[PDB]
Design a protein around this nucleic acid. Structure first.
Ligand SMILES: [Ba+2]
Ligand SMILES: [Ba+2]
Ligand SMILES: [Ba+2]
Ligand SMILES: [Ba+2]
Ligand SMILES: [Ba+2]
Ligand SMILES: [Ba+2]
Ligand SMILES: [Ba+2]
Ligand SMILES: [Ba+2]
Ligand SMILES: [Ba+2]
Ligand SMILES: [Ba+2]
Ligand SMILES: [Ba+2]
Ligand SMILES: [Ba+2]
Ligand SMILES: [Ba+2]
Ligand SMILES: [Ba+2]
Ligand SMILES: [Mg+2]
Ligand SMILES: [Mg+2]
Length: 1032
RNA sequence: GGUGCUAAGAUUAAUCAGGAUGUUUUUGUACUCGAAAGAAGCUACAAAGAUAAGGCUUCAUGCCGAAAUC
DNA sequence: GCTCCTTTATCCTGATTAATCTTAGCAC
DNA sequence: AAAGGAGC
């Protein structure tokens, strides 16, 4: 029997076939949408955002306790919030402030303490006075030109400003001690080291340094260093360690071939020669082996991308011999390997200093020698940033001798010396998508082996190329052209800056991305492609903050993190671009060149790549909800791990189940060669792909039989499906929009109602204006201004709609719908609120009554005159009951937001009383029998009692709170329904809108839960237990 | 075809430290109404508060909450 | 009650560790 | 993609 596997990011196709007969024994499709674990990006983003906001709020709490302890303010209730803190930040610079005015000035400073990778207050206040606003990024007029500002300042300048304030206060006030000044500046300027992370000695967290086990790490990334290829409980050596340098050159030398393999002695010559000579390269070493022992006679050396020969040259050692306050020759091996550990992993003074103190014996270093090691590590980031060797040192020491003694390379030597736990298999893998699909692929083969015994062969499709030589040469030419323009960009940055042919290592400190910034910089003709302005190398390197690397098509939508989706632009031009493509954004941007100019530049030049040109000019209105390379990387990763784990399992246990490999491009043409047809948008193709995989393996060796069986029209209608149920609570609970509500009468009601508000963020975009007219043609009274400012609406905005075009002839002589608000803007500036003396504020956003408040989460401030809510509440599970009096089913729906952390306990749970309240409000009778609980992707069987039809569905959720017992379902064999698809008569047909929403509380109904193993074998469940499971 | 070491070129993953926003509440100022006191809560700016629902203990460079465990 | 229709926050700056392909040079 | 009020 032969087992095929098509492992993917959200599916694994399974299929078995009796090799002699060619008969199909099992076909199956295992599904687990990869979108669930791909959301980890959202989880990390939100965890990090919460930490930034937690600490910003903690900064002003820490400031409160500082003012309390100093005895300057005890009562924080009478603290005004309507004075100008920016002006007191200027007054305090020279004149005396009240303690309340000082606390307002410093609290304002702590909430915007600037970047750290005329004082700021005076720059901010001047923007307050001359343009009426300071925050965010906005446009300002600059003598005919529009310029862009943003409230971003160095933390150094904020600290500089605050210091002058408090020192000036000190001469007026004595309660302001030197310690008070010290403690505040740490509140203001304090940051955590990136290699420490969260926590404190009492606040244990395994995200950071203070581990819950009680251990305190020096650097939280040390534990992430890889393990040895053969010693899984041994960390690997630094590239710059002595052990790894000796192993590297030793194996380099034996892989040469010489007229006289080199002898044992012959290597120690070269090792000593290169170790004690200062300058060393590949030629000059070979120039020594040849001209001192014919370089053309030596062969078997690894070659450059370009074609230069290369070899290991103890580069790390030579540089470490240059140290003046220490002598590398005076240190033994494990001390020099340990030194390279510390200097590879740590990039900061304190991290190195702490690691030296805690890993070496107390008398091992002096301050001056750690002082030199600090300056040394920074000056050689290019060497200690190269990472780690694939081997531990332990293994190399069991290998370096025998590489001296014998002429064999590492592969040759290791030969000489000589069911799957899916969780341990994926214990140390930090990619939840790869870790999941691997875990799914192994759970299957274990169940396949249980039901069938071992197999002659288990075949895994791989996505590796097979290329002929024209093509192969076709890859290195490109990979070499890639390395060529980086050098070309660096060389050019060097001459433009230094005039020399190399940039000083001083410029890359705290700015390792410069090598890439320069590369895109060179590709954009040294011009920012949104401003049309030149980017001077001096400005870039010398003033790095003025620029940012924009994702051309924003990553929120595309997830395309390649170079071809990146451009170096001025920072303000990237912030104004926002979550938009240049096409959507450029013409609307105030400080920017026209999209036409950008088009011209892009087509005109010979610097941008082919794919970079499409992305900069796609007039495609891409969107986040329109019906990626991570998929390819992770599929390769998952399939591989499964393969290796299978081979190694069948040797260490000697099962002699062969394990073969097939490539995707071969299966694709085979499927074309055979009579294989793919059903549109269906999960069937994962299964039959796996049978093409199993079949590929027995090709050398009933063949037509298998195919005919396969071709059978009747074949698909009996392929099995199994889905991974999701029981997890505490997923994303709702949409993020925070909604206001008001009491109003809208449309057909004559009783005040609670309406959720909506708002048009900017009426000067086309999307902003089209939204305006949809609401306008339907019911102008929806706009809150219509009701609360009819003068502005009737005497400003209605004339504008009347007297400005809503369309226009474009560049191409094609009528395009234009925006009357926008066309007024270009002429008179912003539409302004109605006023007698032309004094009204500008108009940018319009709130309107949207929809009636229904289901929601209440986040209402005690302060608020109206409720504030969150909407689109996501569901967790549905509890199925049955009422004997009515003979109908009653379905209770639980949402993530029904569970919470219990005060006091800290347990995440729902209580019976709340569960009983939900049970009531959902129409479940308190005297009704519990039947089962359905989670997402569980499967249902819905039977009609009267006509005996039955349909198998998978569960999604309980939908529509108002419509009791209503449930959204999904298909058994595909991702979604199309719409109008016929179901059993009781449920009619699925809504043409696509979503299958049916109520299951009708009399004529029968529903059972269906479990499957990962193979597709179904079990009918008609009752699970006496009561629902609520163990927490 | 699998695999080991090395180097490069491409992609991507996990995790940490920070910035500036956005949403909404309240207040102030402006705009509108009013003789003012104020009203209205639109519109703009500023400040203060909340920012997945919600929790923790050790009182702080405090900690956890959208993944995985099926 | 059953189906149609609208709706849905984001841009960056530092840093480390790991993976998978694809070329190369050697090899079981 | 799916919540759920709008719309009838
Ligand atoms: Ba803005
Ligand atoms: Ba020396
Ligand atoms: Ba590195
Ligand atoms: Ba080919
Ligand atoms: Ba909107
Ligand atoms: Ba939603
Ligand atoms: Ba190979
Ligand atoms: Ba007045
Ligand atoms: Ba007044
Ligand atoms: Ba008021
Ligand atoms: Ba704010
Ligand atoms: Ba909270
Ligand atoms: Ba109704
Ligand atoms: Ba809605
Ligand atoms: Mg961008
Ligand atoms: Mg649809």
């Amino acid at each position: 029997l032969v087992l095929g596997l098509d492992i993917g990011i959200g599916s694994v196709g399974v299929g078995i076939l009796n090799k002699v007969t060619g008969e199909i024994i099992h076909k199956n499709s295992r599904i687990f949408p990869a979108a669930q674990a791909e959301n980890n990006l959202v989880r990390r983003t939100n965890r990090q955002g919460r930490r930034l906001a937690r600490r910003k709020k903690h900064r002003r709490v820490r400031l409160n306790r500082l003012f309390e302890e100093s005895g300057l303010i005890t009562d924080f209730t009478k603290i005004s919030i309507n004075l100008n803190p920016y002006q007191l930040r200027v007054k305090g610079l020279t004149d005396e402030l009240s303690n309340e005015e000082l606390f307002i000035a410093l609290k304002n400073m702590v909430k915007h303490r600037g970047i750290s990778y005329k004082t700021p207050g005076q720059i901010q206040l001047e923007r307050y006075q001359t343009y009426g606003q300071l925050r965010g990024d906005f446009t300002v007029e600059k003598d005919g030109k529009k310029h862009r500002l943003i409230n971003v300042f160095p933390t150094s300048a904020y600290r500089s400003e605050a210091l002058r304030i408090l020192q000036t206060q000190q001469e007026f006030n004595p309660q302001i001690t030197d310690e008070f000044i010290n403690r505040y500046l740490e509140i203001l300027t304090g940051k955590r080291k990136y290699y420490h992370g969260p926590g404190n000695e009492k606040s244990r967290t395994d995200y950071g340094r203070y581990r819950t086990s009680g251990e305190t790490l020096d650097n939280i990334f040390g534990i992430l260093i890889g393990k040895c290829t053969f010693y899984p409980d041994e960390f690997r050596a630094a590239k710059a360690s002595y052990t790894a340098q000796e192993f590297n050159l030793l194996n380099d030398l034996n892989n040469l071939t010489v007229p006289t393999k080199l002898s044992k002695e012959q290597k120690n010559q070269i090792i000593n020669y290169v170790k004690n000579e200062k300058a060393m390269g590949p030629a000059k070493l070979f120039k020594y082996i040849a001209k001192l022992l014919d370089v053309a006679d030596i062969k078997g050396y690894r070659i450059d991308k370009s074609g230069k020969a290369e070899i290991h040259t103890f580069e790390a050692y030579r540089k470490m011999k240059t140290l003046e306050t220490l002598d590398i020759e005076q240190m033994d091996r494990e001390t020099l390997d340990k030194l390279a550990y510390v200097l590879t992993l740590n990039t900061e003074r304190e991290g190195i200093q702490e690691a030296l103190e805690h890993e070496f014996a107390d008398g091992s270093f002096s301050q001056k020698q750690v002082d030199e090691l600090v300056q040394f590590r920074k000056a050689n980031s290019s060497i200690f940033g190269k990472g780690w060797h694939n081997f531990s040192v332990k293994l190399m020491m069991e290998l370096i001798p025998e590489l001296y003694e014998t002429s064999e390379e590492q592969m040759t030597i290791l030969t000489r010396l000589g069911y799957i736990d899916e969780k341990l298999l994926t214990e140390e893998i930090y990619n939840p998508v790869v870790a999941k699909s691997v875990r799914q692929a192994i759970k299957i083969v274990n169940a396949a082996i249980k039901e069938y015994g071992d197999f002659d062969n288990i075949v895994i499709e791989m996505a590796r190329e097979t290329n002929e030589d024209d093509e192969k040469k076709a890859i290195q030419k490109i990979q070499k052209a890639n390395k060529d323009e980086k050098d070309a960009a660096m060389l050019k940055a060097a001459n433009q800056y230094n005039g020399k042919a190399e940039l000083p290592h001083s410029v890359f400190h705290g700015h390792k991305q410069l090598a890439t910034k320069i590369r895109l910089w060179h590709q954009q003709g040294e011009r920012c492609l949104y401003t049309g302005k030149t980017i001077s190398i001096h400005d870039l390197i010398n003033n790095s903050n003025q620029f940012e690397v924009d994702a051309i098509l924003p990553l929120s939508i595309t997830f395309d993190d390649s170079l071809a989706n990146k451009v170096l632009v001025y920072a303000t031009a990237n912030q104004e671009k926002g979550q938009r493509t240049p096409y959507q954004a450029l013409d609307s941007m105030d400080d920017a060149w026209s999209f036409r100019e950008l088009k011209a530049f892009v087509r005109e030049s010979k610097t941008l790549s082919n794919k970079k040109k499409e992305y900069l000019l796609t007039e495609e209105d891409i969107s986040k909800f329109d019906v990626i390379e991570r998929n390819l990387v992770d599929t390769r990763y998952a399939s591989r791990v499964v393969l290796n784990a299978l081979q190694e399992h069948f040797r260490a246990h000697k099962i002699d189940t062969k394990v073969s490999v097939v490539r995707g491009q071969f299966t694709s043409q085979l499927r074309r060669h055979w009579g294989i047809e793919k059903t549109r948008d269906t999960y069937h193709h994962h299964a039959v792909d796996a049978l093409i995989i199993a079949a590929s393996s027995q090709l050398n060796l009933p063949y037509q039989h298998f195919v005919d069986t396969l071709k059978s029209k009747e074949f698909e209608d009996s392929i099995l499906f199994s889905y991974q149920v999701d029981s997890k609570f505490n997923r994303k609970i709702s949409d993020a929009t925070i909604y206001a509500t008001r009491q109003a009468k809208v449309g057909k009601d004559k009783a005040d109602e609670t309406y959720v508000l909506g708002k048009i963020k900017d009426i000067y975009t086309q999307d902003g204006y089209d939204a305006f007219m949809k609401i306008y043609k339907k019911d102008k009274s929806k706009f809150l201004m219509y009701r609360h400012d009819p003068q502005t609406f009737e005497k400003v905005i209605e004339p504008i709609l009347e007297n400005y075009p809503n369309k226009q002839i474009n560049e191409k002589g094609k009528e395009v719908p234009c925006n009357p608000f926008l066309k007024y803007k270009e002429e008179h500036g912003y539409i302004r609120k109605y006023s007698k003396k032309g004094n009204g504020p500008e108009i940018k956003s319009l709130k309107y009554y949207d929809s009636k408040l229904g289901n929601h989460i209440d986040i209402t401030p005690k302060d608020s005159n109206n409720k504030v809510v969150l909407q689109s509440v996501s569901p967790w599970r549905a509890d199925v009951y049955f009422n004997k009096t009515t003979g109908k089913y009653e379905i209770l729906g639980l949402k993530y937001a029904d569970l919470q952390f219990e005060k006091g306990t800290g347990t995440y749970k729902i209580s019976q009383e709340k569960y009983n309240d939900i049970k009531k409000k959902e129409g479940v009778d308190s005297d009704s029998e519990f039947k089962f609980t359905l989670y997402k992707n569980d499967l249902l069987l819905v039977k009609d009692t009267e006509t005996k039809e039955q349909q198998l569905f998978r569960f999604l959720s309980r939908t529509m709170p108002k419509q009791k017992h209503y449930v959204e379902l999904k298909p058994y064999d595909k991702q979604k329904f199309e719409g109008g698809e016929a179901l059993i008569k009781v449920l009619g047909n699925v809504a043409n809108s696509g979503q299958c929403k049916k109520g299951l509380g009708k009399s004529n109904i029968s529903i059972y839960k269906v479990r499957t193993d990962v193979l597709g074998n179904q079990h009918i469940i008609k009752n699970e237990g006496d009561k629902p499971k609520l163990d927490f």
